[PDB]
Design a protein around this motif. Structure first.
Motif, short mmCIF file in Angstrom:
data_model
loop_
_atom_site.label_atom_id
_atom_site.label_comp_id
_atom_site.label_asym_id
_atom_site.label_seq_id
_atom_site.Cartn_x
_atom_site.Cartn_y
_atom_site.Cartn_z
N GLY A 17 1.50 -0.43 3.32
CA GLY A 17 1.71 -1.79 2.83
C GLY A 17 1.95 -2.84 3.90
N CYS A 66 0.46 -5.21 7.21
CA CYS A 66 -0.79 -5.79 7.70
C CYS A 66 -0.86 -5.69 9.22
CB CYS A 66 -0.95 -7.23 7.25
SG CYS A 66 -0.99 -7.38 5.47
N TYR A 102 -8.47 2.56 -0.78
CA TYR A 102 -9.20 1.90 0.31
C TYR A 102 -9.41 2.83 1.51
CZ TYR A 102 -8.63 -2.68 -2.05
OH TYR A 102 -8.68 -3.74 -2.94
N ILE A 127 -1.48 0.35 7.38
CA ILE A 127 -2.11 -0.35 6.26
C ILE A 127 -1.76 0.30 4.93
CG2 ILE A 127 -4.36 -0.79 5.19
CD1 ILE A 127 -5.39 -1.45 8.05
N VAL A 128 -1.83 1.63 4.87
CA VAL A 128 -1.63 2.32 3.61
C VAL A 128 -0.18 2.19 3.13
CG1 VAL A 128 -0.97 4.67 4.35
CG2 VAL A 128 -2.33 4.31 2.25
N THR A 166 -3.56 2.35 -5.11
CA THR A 166 -4.69 1.46 -4.82
C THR A 166 -4.89 1.27 -3.32
OG1 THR A 166 -4.35 0.31 -6.92
CG2 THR A 166 -5.77 -0.78 -5.31
N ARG A 167 -3.79 1.14 -2.58
CA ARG A 167 -3.89 1.06 -1.13
C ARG A 167 -4.52 2.35 -0.60
NH1 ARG A 167 2.03 -0.87 -1.05
NH2 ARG A 167 2.30 1.16 0.01
N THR A 221 0.64 -4.55 -3.74
CA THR A 221 -0.42 -3.68 -4.24
C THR A 221 0.09 -2.25 -4.44
OG1 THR A 221 -2.13 -5.08 -3.22
CG2 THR A 221 -2.78 -2.86 -3.86
N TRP A 225 -0.39 -7.77 -0.34
CA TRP A 225 -0.76 -6.40 0.01
C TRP A 225 0.42 -5.48 -0.27
CZ3 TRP A 225 -4.68 -3.43 0.13
CH2 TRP A 225 -4.70 -2.23 0.87
N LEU A 273 -11.47 -3.89 1.90
CA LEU A 273 -10.09 -4.22 2.22
C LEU A 273 -9.89 -5.73 2.23
CD1 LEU A 273 -7.49 -2.52 3.13
CD2 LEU A 273 -8.14 -3.28 5.45
N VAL A 289 -5.58 -8.14 5.97
CA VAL A 289 -4.87 -6.87 6.03
C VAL A 289 -5.20 -6.16 7.36
CG1 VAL A 289 -4.52 -4.61 4.91
CG2 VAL A 289 -4.66 -6.69 3.48
#
Ligand SMILES: Cc1cc2nc3c(=O)[nH]c(=O)nc-3n(C[C@H](O)[C@H](O)[C@H](O)COP(=O)(O)OP(=O)(O)OC[C@H]3O[C@@H](n4cnc5c(N)ncnc54)[C@H](O)[C@@H]3O)c2cc1C
Ligand SMILES: O=C(O)[C@@H]1CCCO1
Ligand SMILES: O=C(O)[C@@H]1CCCO1
Lengths: 979, 977
Positions: A648, A650, A549, A645-646, A545-546, A541, A538, A675, A679
C-alpha cells in the motif's frame, strides 16, 4: 496371452535352476549381507551406512577415521552387533565391499582378471572408473588409460580362444562378437559438458571419443557409449550420431538408451529412423537407468517435468516394449539386453524366439559382482553373457559404488524382492503392463483463496532445442530496438530532461543500447509529490486488489521471459542462464509477495475476552524511495518495488545508471498491469545531483536500498534525521555487501566442491553480493583442492556473454574494471597468483578470471569487497581456525561449507553466523521462499527478501478495540471465552 | 421421597395455574401488535435482535430528522430491506413500547396512575427511573424527586381504603401492609460509588438514603433498597445494615438479594444471623437478578470468577432453596417473592403452606407492564400482589427498558418458553434441581504450558483486597532509608554520587538514596553484558523462557508489596499501582510463550534433496532506557523481551523511580538469571546518556519516553563507530497527543466517566492519556456541562488515600512544566474547571479542563503529560476526524458513537496505533491491545503483541544439500512422487 505364458514359464524355469542361491549382497552369512540387511530394515541406518561409504576414502588418517566412525555410528556399545581394532575391521569390510564390484585397481590387474572371466565362460565390456571430469588434464589421463588398455588387449587377444557358440567365426566370441569390448563415459571426456554450450560440448567430447574409437577400430573391437544423466542425454546422442557417420562402414559401435525415460520411445524410434535414412547399422544397449533418484530430485528442484517414469513397473513395461521394437529391427539394430531382472530377461528371450531373431543380433549383459545366480542362469540358458567390468580406484569409482548399493537395496528392486523379501514368484513374473494398470489405479486414490500455492518459476532448460534456439533469436530482436531515449515516468506521464547518459554493452562498449534522461531535484520532487498524491487512494485499495496487480505484472513478464532476458545479456553482460534466472526471480517476488499480502491483509482478532473485539492489522508507511542495484536489475528492483507497492505504499524508483533500460521494464510491466498513476514513478538520476535529495526529503517514509556498504551506511545516517514537515521516522530496508567464505574441510567431496566453488566465485564475473571471494581450505586437503580448482579454471573461457561458450565475460563498466584490476594487483602483492586467465583482445571491460593463494585474514583482499572475478585462497591449520577465519570480516551475508563430518557441520550451523549458510553446495543463487536472503553485521539490517517476515517491514501495525456491550448486553462471537 | 411428594403438589398447582390462564398472552407476545412483531422477529433472528435493541438504546439521542433517517437506514437497511412492520410512525411505536413499562413520565401523572392501580386491586412499590448518576446535583435532583413524591402520597393516603384482606386493620393493605412503598437505587445517590473507596461510598449513599427514609417513616411507609451490579453489592448491604441499626425499631425497611449470585446462599445466611444477633427484624425481596449478561462479560474481561450461576436452572434452584430459607425464618424476616415464573411462584406457595407461614409475612411482586396473565393469576389465588411501578424519562430509564427487553426475549426466559415457544408444560414445571443435574452432566460430555491469560486485576469487592493496601503501604514504610547500588555482573557496586528519591505526594518523605553510575561504571556494565552474551545466546530458548516464568512467579507472590512501593514512590493510585504490576507479569508470561513459539527452526520451501531452516539470532548487548510513568511494567517489558531473545541488558531506570527499577534486580535474582545478563545502572543522563547510546558494543536500544529524547537517540544511534558490529536496532515508544471524539449520538452516560478517567487517570501521566476531546457541535454544551459536573465531584490528593481520584504529579520539574502549559492553555482557550488542591507540601497540579481549543493552539499540539484537558468544538463529523488527525502524533484515540457509518469512517481514517470504540483510550492489556504507533509516536513496534520479539533478533537461514552420490533422505513435507 500366449507369449506372456511362455515368458512366465521361462521365468519359472529360471528361478528353478537358481536353486535358492542368493547373490553375495543378500548373503546374511557375510558382513556385506548383514550390513545391507540392516540398511534394508532400518532407513536411518541405510542413510548412515551409505554416507559413510561415500566419505570413507577421504578418511586418510587415524584421527579422521576414528572420529568419523564414532560420529556416523555412535560408540562401540550402541552400534549393531555385526559391526584401534575397530578402525581396522571396518576398513577391511568397506575395502572388500568396494573390490566386490571391480576387476582390478590398475590396467595390468584388470587384464589379468579379464582372462580369468573368459575361462569361466564370460565375455566382458571393460570400463575405466570415472565420470564428470574436472579438467582437460584429467580427461587426457582417462583417455590415455583407455589407449593403454587397448594396447595391452591388442597383445593378448590373439591368444584367447573365442567363447563357444553354435556357428560363425571360431576366432570371435560365440562365433560373432569382437573379443575386445569397452565402454566410455562422455562426461569423463570434458569437464564443462553443458547443453547451454551444445556444440562446444559435442565437439570436445567427440574429439576424445574419436581418438579412443580409432584405437578400438585398429583391433576390430567394440566401443559402447554409456548414457549418463538427462542433462547430457541429447549431447551424448549427437556424439554417437556424428561418430557413427565418420565411420559409417564400421559395425562395432554402440550407444545406451534408458527405458526409464519418458523420452525413450521417441528417442528409440528417431534413432532407428535415422539409421535407415543414412543406411547405417547401429547397436543399442537397452538399460532401465541408473540415475532415478537424482533425476526426480533435480527436476523437482527446478520445477521441470520429471523426465523418468515414477511407477517402477512403467520402466519395466517400457523396457519390454522397446526391446520388442529393437528385436523387430534386428537387421539395422544389434541388441544388448542389460538387466538383472528375470522377468525382463525372460521376456527378451521369448520375444527373440518368437521373432526368430539370429543369435548374433542379441546378447545379455550384467554388472560385475552382482546378481551372481542370475548371471550363471543366463550363461546356462542363453550362453551369451557379458559382464560390465570396471576398474580403478575408490574415489573416482564412488558414484558407481553407491549406485550399486542403491540398486540392490531399493524397495522396488527386483533383486531385493527376489532375494531378501521372499516375494511370490507369480507377482515377480507378472506382465508389468498389468502391474502398471493396477498401480496407476491405486495412485488415483494446496493454495489459498482460489490461488494455486507458491512455486518458483521453472528455470530455463537447455536440454530443449527450442530453449537453445530462443536466445540468439531474442538477442537479434533486441538489437533492432537499440538507440531509443528513455524518459522519466512520473504520475503516468513521460517526462523528458535534457541531461542524457548513454548505456552500453559492457562486452562491446561501442554498441550503444540507448540514452537515459536524468532527473534533477525538481523532477524527483515532482515524483515524490505524485506518489504522495496517489497514496491515500492506493492505501485505501483492498489488499487483494493490490495483490492482483502484482499477479498481472507477473503474467506480463512471463509472456516476455526470453525477451526480457536478452536485454540483460546485452546491457549488463549476463550469461544466458544468469539473465533468465534474473527474470524468473522477478516473477517469483511478484507471485510470492502477492500471496503474502493476501495472507497478511485480513485483520485478525486478538484476545478472547467477551464484550470486546480487538483487530490487529497493518497500514502502509507512505512514499518509498527504492534505490536499485545494477547486478540484479530486474529481480531485486521488482522485489523491492513490488513489496512496497503491494503493502500500500507508493514508490519513487531510482534504477542504477548502467541498467536503466532494465529499470524501464518495471514501467512496461506495471503499465501493462494497469497500476494506477503515481503508484510507481521511474526516476533515474545522478546520485551526485539527487541522491541525498531523495533520501533527505521530508515526504519519504521508507527507503529500500540494495548496494555498497559505504552508501547504505550513509543513507542510514542521513535518514535518521527528522526534518520539518516530516511525518514519520524513516524506515530503512537495506542490503549491503559481503565478503563470503566457503570452507573446504578435510573430508570434503572434492568433485562437488570444485565446480561449486568455481561457480560461486566466477558466476556472472563474481558480481553478486553472495559471491564466494574467500575459499578457506583445510591444510591436509589444500594441494589436492587447489590443483583441481586451478585446472578446472584453466578450462573455462572469458568472453562476451552473448556467446554461450564463455564461462564469464566483461564486468559492469569501465570504473568496475579499473577498480577490480587494482584489487588484483593488491592481492598479487599480498599473496601469490595461482591462476590468471587470458581475456579477448580489443574492446570490452574484461578482467581476468583470477585466483590468488597465500591469503590471510589480515590482508586487504581477505577483508574488502572486490565485486569481481578475484578469489582469495586461505590455508587453515585446523577446523577451529577455519571457522575463526570465516568469521574474521565485518560482513555476514552468505557462507558455505563442504564437509561430511556431523560434528563440523553442527559447529558450523552454530558458529558460522552468516545470514544464509550453505552446506555442500554453492553459496549463491538464493530462491524465493526456499532461501530468504539477507544478513546483519555490515551486510544489512536483518531484513530478508523472499521470506515471510519481509512485507512487515513496509507497514506499521494498527489495533482497533471495540467495546461491543450496550446497556448490559453484547453479541457473542465464535472465538469468545464464554460459559 | 418427601421431596417427590411436595414436588407433585407444586407441579399440580402450576398445572392449574396454566389451565386457568390458558389462551391469554402477555402484551409483549401479542404478534398482532407492533410491540409483539418487533419482539417476535427479534426472538427468531439474533442479528435483528442486536440491531433493534441497539436502535432502541440510541433512539432518544436521534434528535433531528437527519440523525433519525440516517440511523434508521444504517441499522435496518433501505426501505425495501427491512421488515414490513415514517420517522413519525416508528417514533410513536418505540415510544409506545417504552410507555408499556412505566406508570408515568412525571410525579403527578405517576400518583394519578397509582391510585388507578389500587382501584384495580394492586399494591405498588414506586421507583424513580435512573441509576449510575453523574454528579452531586443530579443525585440531589433524584433525592428531591422521592421527597416530592412522598409529600404527594402523604396527602393522598388518608383517603385510601386498604386493599381487601382476611383480617386486621382496614386502613392497611390486606389488613397489615403499609400503603406507601418505594424502591430506591443506591448508585443513583452517588456518582463515584466504588468499593475501592468503600467507606466513602457507603457514607455518601447512606446520607442520601437516610434523608429519604426519614420522609418514609414520617408517613409510616416502606422503603426497599434495590440491588444493583455485583461491583456495589457489598456497599449496598452495608448501607442497609447501618440504616437498619439507626432505626432498629422501624420494621418497614427491605433489601433485595439476588439468587443468581453464587454468594447469595452465604449472604442470606449472614444477614439472617446478623439480624438475630442485633435482635432486629428485616424484609427481603428475593429476585433472580437483572444483570446476568453484564456480570458474565465483566468478570471474564478481568480474569475474575464469574459471580453468577451460568446454567439458568441453577438460578431457579437457588431461588427455591433461598425462598425456603427465608420462609423458615418468617418470624424475623418478611418476604417478597419477585418472579414472573409460574414454577417458582407455585413452589413458594406450596412451601409457605408446608411451613404454615402467616400471610402477613409474605407477598408477591411483579414488574409493571409484564406477564399480565401471571399477574392476574396471582391476584386470584393469593390476593397480595404488588407492582413495581417506575416512572420517569426514557433517557435515564433506558437501562431499565433494555433490561426488560432482554428479560422477555432471552432463550432461557420462562415467559418466552410459555408464551412464544409453546414449550411442554411438564418441562416448565419440573424441579429445577433435576434440570440442574441434567444440564451439568450434559456438560460432562502449548506443550505443558497453560495458554496465555492476563493476570487478574485487583478486586475491591473483596474485603481482603481492600485491607491489603493499607497493610502493605505500612509494611513498605518500615523499609525506607536504604542506599541502592548499581548491579553489575552479579555484584553490588556503590558510588559516591547519590540522588534521593521521594514521595511526590509528600516530598519530605525520602524513600531512599540511589547511586549514580559514571561512564566508567556504564562501560563496565556493557563489558559485563558483552562477556555474558556468548553463553546466554547459546542457552536454549525454552530454558531462557523458563527464567521469565520464574520471574513471573516471583512477582505474582509479591503483588501487593510491589504495588505499595509504586503508590509511595511515583504517586500511583491503588488500582493503577496494581495494574502496573500485573502488566509486568503479563509481559513475562507472554514473552516466554512467544520465545517458545519462535525458538524452533522451521523448514521453509518444499524441494526434495534440500533442507532450508529459518530461525532467529539475538543481536548482542541491549541498552534499556526506561520511563517513570509505568516503572515496573514497561521496564520489565523491554528488559525481559531483550533477555528472552538471547540479548544481554544494560538497564537505565528513570531517576525518580529507581527503586522500582531495583525490583527488576530482585526478581531476576530470585529467578536465578546468569550474571551479566541483566545489569542495573542508574545514572545522570548529562553524564552517561550519550555514552550509553553511542557505545560501539551496543547493538540495540529500547527506549520509552519523550519524542525529543527519542529523536535524539535515533539520530546518534544511526552512526556506526569503529569496532561496532551491527547497525543499531531502535525499538522506541514516544508520546501522543490523543483525542477522543464525542459524536452527536454518543451515550453521554458512558462517555463522560470514560473521558474523565482517560484524561485524569494517574494525573494524565500516560502516553495513552486523552488530552484532547473533540465534541460535535450539537452535543457540545450538554457534554461539557456533564463532564464538568462529574469532575467537580472528584478530589485531588495523596494516592495512598483511595478517596482521591488523582494526586500529585511525578516531581517538581513536571509540576513546573505542566503549570506553564496550563497558563498557556488558559490564554488560548477558556477555563471550564480548575480543581482545588491540598494546601501544604506535594507536587499538586489542579485537575484542569479548558474550552475553546482549536488545532492551531499549543495545547492542542504539544504533549503536556499532566492533568490538563483541551475541549474542542467540531462543526461536523468530517472536521472532527480532520482535527483528530491534526497533530504530529498517532498513539491512541477514542470515539464515542453509535453510528455504523461514522464508526466505519473512524476505523478507516482515524489512524492511531490504538483506536478505542465506546470506551476509554487507556489501559491496553497484553495480547488484547498490543500497544504502539508511528508518526512521531514511535517506530511501529507494538509491545505485547505477536510481532514484538522479532525486533530484538535477526533471522538466519541454513540450507543443506542432502543429496550425496545421487541419493537423499525423503523428508515428511517434501514435494515428491
Ligand atoms: C418486583 C421485582 C423487583 C426486582 N428487583 C430487582 C433488583 O432490585 N435487582 C436485580 O438485579 N433484579 C431484580 N429483579 C429481577 C429481574 O428484574 C428479573 O425480573 C428476574 O430476574 C426474572 O426472573 P423470573 O423468575 O421472572 O424469570 P425467569 O425466566 O424465570 O428467570 C430468568 C432469570 O434467570 C437468570 N438467568 C438467566 N440466564 C441464566 C443463566 N444462563 N444462568 C444462570 N442464571 C440465569 C436471570 O437472573 C434471569 O433474570 C426484580 C424482579 C421483580 C419482579
Ligand atoms: O555407471 C553406472 O552406474 C551404469 C552402470 C554401468 C554404466 O552405467
Ligand atoms: O432495574 C431493574 O432492572 C431491576 C428490576 C426492578 C428494579 O431493579
Amino acid at each position: 496371452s500366449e507369449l506372456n505364458t511362455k515368458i512366465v514359464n521361462r521365468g519359472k524355469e529360471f528361478f528353478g535352476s537358481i536353486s535358492g542361491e542368493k547373490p553375495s549382497l543378500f548373503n546374511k552369512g557375510a558382513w556385506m549381507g548383514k550390513a545391507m540387511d540392516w540398511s534394508m530394515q532400518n532407513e536411518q541406518f541405510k542413510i548412515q551406512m551409505f554416507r559413510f561409504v561415500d566419505v570413507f576414502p577421504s578418511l586418510t588418517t587415524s584421527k579422521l577415521l576414528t572420529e568419523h566412525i564414532r560420529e556416523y555410528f555412535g560408540n562401540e556399545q550402541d552400534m549393531p552387533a555385526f559391526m584401534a581394532v575397530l578402525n581396522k575391521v571396518l576398513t577391511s569390510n568397506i575395502e572388500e565391499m568396494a573390490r566386490q564390484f571391480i576387476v582390478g585397481e590398475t590396467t595390468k590387474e584388470a587384464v589379468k582378471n579379464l582372462e580369468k572371466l573368459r575361462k569361466d565362460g564370460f565375455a566382458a565390456v571393460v570400463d575405466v572408473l570415472g565420470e564428470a571430469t574436472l579438467s582437460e588434464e584429467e580427461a587426457e589421463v582417462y583417455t590415455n588409460t583407455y589407449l593403454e588398455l587397448l594396447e595391452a588387449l591388442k597383445k593378448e587377444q590373439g591368444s584367447w580362444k573365442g567363447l563357444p557358440g553354435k556357428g560363425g567365426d571360431p576366432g570371435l566370441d560365440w562365433g560373432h562378437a569382437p573379443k575386445v569390448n569397452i565402454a566410455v563415459k562422455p562426461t569423463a571426456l570434458f569437464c564443462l559438458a553443458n547443453p547451454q554450450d551444445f556444440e562446444g560440448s559435442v565437439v570436445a567430447i567427440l574429439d576424445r571419443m574419436r581418438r579412443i574409437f580409432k584405437k578400438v577400430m585398429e583391433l576390430n573391437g567394440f566401443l559402447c557409449i554409456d548414457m549418463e544423466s538427462y542433462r547430457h542425454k541429447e549431447i551424448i546422442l549427437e556424439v554417437f550420431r556424428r561418430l557413427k557417420l565418420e565411420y559409417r562402414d564400421y559395425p562395432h559401435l554402440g550407444i545406451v538408451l534408458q527405458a526409464y525415460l519418458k523420452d525413450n520411445d521417441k528417442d528409440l524410434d528417431d534413432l532407428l529412423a535415422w539409421a535407415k535414412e543414412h543406411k547405417v547399422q547401429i547397436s543399442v544397449r537397452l538399460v532401465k537407468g541408473a540415475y532415478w533418484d537424482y533425476e526426480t530430485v533435480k527436476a523437482k528442484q527446478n520445477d521441470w517435468e520429471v523426465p523418468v517414469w515414477t511407477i517402477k513397473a512403467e520402466s519395466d513395461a517400457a523396457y519390454e516394449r522397446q526391446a520388442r521394437k529393437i528385436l523387430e529391427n534386428h537387421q539395422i539394430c544389434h541388441f544388448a539386453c542389460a538387466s538383472h531382472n528375470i522377468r525382463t530377461i525372460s521376456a527378451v528371450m521369448e520375444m527373440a524366439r518368437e521373432l526368430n531373431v539370429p543369435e548374433d543380433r542379441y546378447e545379455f549383459q550384467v554388472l560385475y559382482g552382482m546378481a551372481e545366480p542370475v548371471r550363471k542362469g543366463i550363461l546356462k540358458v542363453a550362453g551369451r553373457i557379458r559382464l560390465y567390468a570396471p576398474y580403478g580406484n575408490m574415489v573416482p569409482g564412488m558414484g558407481y559404488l553407491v549406485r550399486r548399493l542403491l540398486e540392490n537395496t531399493a524397495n522396488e528392486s527386483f533383486l531385493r524382492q527376489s532375494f531378501a523379501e521372499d516375494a511370490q514368484i507369480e507377482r515377480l513374473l507378472e506382465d508389468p503392463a498389468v502391474t502398471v494398470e493396477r498401480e496407476r489405479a491405486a495412485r488415483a486414490a494446496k493454495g489459498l483463496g482460489g490461488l494455486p500455492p507458491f512455486n518458483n518459476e521453472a528455470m530455463v532448460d537447455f536440454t530443449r532445442a527450442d530453449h537453445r534456439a530462443a536466445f540468439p533469436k531474442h538477442i537479434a530482436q533486441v538489437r533492432t530496438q537499440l538507440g531509443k531515449t528513455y524518459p522519466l515516468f512520473i504520475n503516468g506521464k513521460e517526462v523528458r530532461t535534457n541531461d542524457l547518459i548513454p548505456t552500453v554493452n559492457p562486452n562491446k562498449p561501442s554498441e550503444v543500447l540507448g540514452q537515459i534522461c536524468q532527473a534533477g531535484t525538481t523532477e524527483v520532487g515532482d515524483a515524490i509529490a505524485a506518489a504522495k498524491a496517489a497514496f491515500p487512494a492506493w492505501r485505501d485499495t483492498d489488499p487483494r486488489t493490490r495483490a492482483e496487480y502484482l499477479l498481472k505484472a507477473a503474467q506480463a513478464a512471463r509472456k516476455r521471459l526470453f525477451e526480457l532476458s536478452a536485454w540483460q545479456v546485452l546491457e549488463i553482460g549476463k550469461q544466458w542462464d544468469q539473465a533468465y534466472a534474473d527474470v524468473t526471480e522477478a516473477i517469483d517476488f511478484l507471485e510470492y509477495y502477492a500471496r503474502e499480502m493476501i495472507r497478511l491483509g485480513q485483520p485478525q482478532r486478538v484476545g478472547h475476552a467477551p464484550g470486546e473485539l480487538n483487530h490487529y492489522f497493518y497500514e502502509p508507511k507512505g512514499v518509498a524511495a527504492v534505490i536499485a542495484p545494477w547486478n540484479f536489475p530486474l529481480a531485486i528492483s521488482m522485489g523491492m518495488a513490488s513489496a512496497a507497492i503491494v503493502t500500500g505504499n507508493c514508490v519513487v524508483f531510482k534504477p542504477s545508471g548502467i541498467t536503466s533500460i532494465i529499470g524501464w521494464h518495471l514501467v512496461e510491466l506495471f503499465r501493462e498491469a494497469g497500476l494506477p498513476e503515481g503508484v510507481f514513478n521511474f526516476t533515474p538520476g545522478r546520485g551526485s545531483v539527487m541522491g541525498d535529495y531523495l533520501v533527505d526529503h521530508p515526504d519519504i517514509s521508507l527507503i529500500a536500498f540494495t548496494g555498497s556498504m559505504e552508501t547504505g551506511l550513509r543513507i542510514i545516517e542521513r535518514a535518521a534525521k527528522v526534518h520539518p514537515g516530516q511525518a514519520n521516522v524513516k524506515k530503512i530496508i537495506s542490503e549491503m555487501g559481503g565478503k563470503n567464505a566457503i570452507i573446504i574441510d578435510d573430508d570434503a567431496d572434492l568433485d562437488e566442491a570444485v565446480p561449486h566453488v568455481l561457480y560461486s566465485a566466477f558466476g556472472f564475473q563474481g558480481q553478486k553480493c553472495s559471491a564466494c571471494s574467500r575459499v578457506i581450505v583445510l591444510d591436509a586437503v589444500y594441494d589436492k583442492f587447489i590443483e583441481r580448482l586451478v585446472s578446472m579454471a584453466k578450462a573455462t573461457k572469458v568472453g562476451p556473454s552473448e556467446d554461450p561458450a564463455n564461462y564469464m565475460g566483461a564486468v559492469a563498466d569501465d570504473k568496475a574494471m579499473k577498480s577490480i584490476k587494482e584489487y588484483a594487483e593488491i592481492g598479487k602483492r599480498e599473496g601469490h597468483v595461482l591462476y590468471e586467465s587470458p581475456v579477448p583482445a580489443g574492446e570490452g571491460y574484461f578482467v581476468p578470471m583470477t585466483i590468488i593463494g597465500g591469503i590471510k585474514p589480515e590482508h586487504r583482499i581477505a577483508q574488502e569487497e572486490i565485486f569481481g572475478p578475484v578469489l582469495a585462497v586461505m590455508r587453515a591449520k585446523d577446523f577451529d581456525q577455519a571457522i575463526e577465519w570465516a568469521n574474521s570480516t565485518q560482513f555476514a551475508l552468505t557462507g558455505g561449507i563442504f564437509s561430511r563430518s556431523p560434528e563440523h557441520l553442527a559447529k558450523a550451523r552454530r558458529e558460522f553466523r552468516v545470514g544464509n549458510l550453505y552446506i555442500n553446495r554453492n553459496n549463491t543463487g538464493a530462491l524465493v521462499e526456499r532461501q530468504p536472503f539477507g544478513g546483519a553485521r555490515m551486510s544489512g539490517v536483518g531484513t530478508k527478501a523472499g521470506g515471510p517476515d519481509y512485507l512487515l517491514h513496509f507497514m506499521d501495525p494498527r489495533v482497533v478495540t471495540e467495546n461491543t456491550m450496550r446497556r448490559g448486553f453484547a453479541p457473542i462471537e465464535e472465538d469468545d471465552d464464554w460459559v
